Design a protein around this ligand. Sequence first.
Ligand SMILES: [Zn+2]
Ligand SMILES: [Zn+2]
Ligand SMILES: [Zn+2]
Length: 98
Amino acid sequence: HMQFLEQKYGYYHCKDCNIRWESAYVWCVQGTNKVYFKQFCRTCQKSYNPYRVEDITCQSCKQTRCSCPVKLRHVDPKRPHRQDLCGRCKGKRLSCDS
Ligand SMILES: [Zn+2]
Ligand SMILES: [Zn+2]
Ligand SMILES: [Zn+2]
């Protein structure tokens, strides 16, 4: 099995393109802030870790570090996930948020 990963919230900045983005699908080594998968800048297509990681506040139970199966709804038109810029799912048929 791959090590368990912990979905967290990340803040990113590509200084070369001066593009900031955020993501609710930052995959961390569980229990840590170590980021296991890169995300890619939409303009220069280089790989980045976020400069800041935060625990997700669960929208099911309102806690951090909870055991709920889903903390943030999937398939969310108001909160898209760029599959093509995600180190975890850019090569897969189903995105992280599918
Ligand atoms: Zn860039
Ligand atoms: Zn929860
Ligand atoms: Zn993904």
